[model samples]
Target: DAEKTLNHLISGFETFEKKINYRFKNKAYLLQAFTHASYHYNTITDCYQRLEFLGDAILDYLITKHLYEDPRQHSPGVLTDLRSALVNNTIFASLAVKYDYHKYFKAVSPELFHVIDDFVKFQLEKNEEDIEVPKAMGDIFESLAGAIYMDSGMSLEVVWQVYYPMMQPLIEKFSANVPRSPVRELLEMEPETAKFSPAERTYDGKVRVTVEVVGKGKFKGVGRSYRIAKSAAARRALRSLK
Candidate 1:
């Protein structure tokens, strides 16, 4: 049964490879990236939800790190708005549609609904508010992070690198008259929706990073180099969403 399920996962990767024209190292992770827990309720092991946990963190760090890195001074309100626009549902749903998110979706549950609803809400917000969103998006934007982390052997920088290009295009997602939090309000807003939410940032050699996510339990980021560790923890946190 495991082999059969793994085979299906392999097949999913092949479908994705053809769809996106990119090759991945470990087909299993790619499979896990899209596997909804609803598909494995009867199974013994954890599901893609774990990878989603990790993906969410890596994504937040990449985006937030990008913004936080800049010496360019901006109010926290504007930054918060930008993070929501970039990481929330509307953009992801569009990416989901672009990548045929439904095609990759394995099952439906409250979890899946929450994920989809966010995407739907995001789209609705844009339409009602005239906020343009991105279509050519990444693994629901975060699923790709799940894929990258597993394929790259849990390297945050490498995973972030794979996603940075996609993120670069959406740079304007933060640049409106809209004032928002530079820090990650999505973390707070999405606490139980996936894992908990992103926690506060800590200082590194020259960077600011998260030490932990609230409600998701203790993350590796809570260790020494808490900031860097939290980046690792964030990846783990995002896995829950997968």
Candidate 2:
């Protein structure tokens, strides 16, 4: 099965290269980008995590540069908000689905398949509200970016050229809204009714925060820090109220 899967994957990569309009000089890099840790647990093959890390940094730089050079000359705070809104798992995961890139993933874990399938189904419905998106879906996008970077001899220009057009629609769509501080907005709207819970550290090392409104339902957010978690909860709460 492994050998057969490899044959199929090699063929799939050809289609993927055509779709992205970038051919991989080192196809191993492309394969590594789609490989999950579970697929080669005991083998001496690389997975997507390291590539995801590199991709994350590369994307941050490119997006920041694009936003900074925009003619609108947004305030620094607004730039930060816009960056956050654009560079998150939900958006990346949706992009993965949009391009059918998720079909190329190599994972031995059944749980991962289940999660990806659920997200794909949700995406097909074209609902905008945030749903639970598996981190791996986003990770693959970053990993692929990383692969492109490495395959192009660490060329930032190459990565940007490939990704800018792919990301441009999202930028245009999100930039129109100009993300606001959800917590701040919620507080202003429900000054007396909005209440935040004490921050708690979850087992996964994420900070968990929840907000409860007197007339609105409670919302929970989990993130790497307290402020982010609070922002997430408030964003959900605001969405719920809307």
Collision count for each candidate, in order: 35, 0
Task: State candidate 1's TM-score.
Answer: 0.53
Best by lDDT: 2
Per-residue lDDT for 24-116 in model 1, tens only?
A: 776666666666656753253345666666778888877888776654444565577677777775565565554555566655566555665
After superposition, candidate 2 runs with Cα above 4 Å error: 1-9, 41-44, 127-130, 179-242
The lDDT values for all models are 0.57, 0.83
Query: For candidate 1, what is the total of clashing residue pairs?
Result: 35
* Local accuracy of candidate 2 as per-residue lDDT tens digits, 12-45: 6888888888889878788889888877642434
Please report the candidate that would top TM-score against the real structure: 2
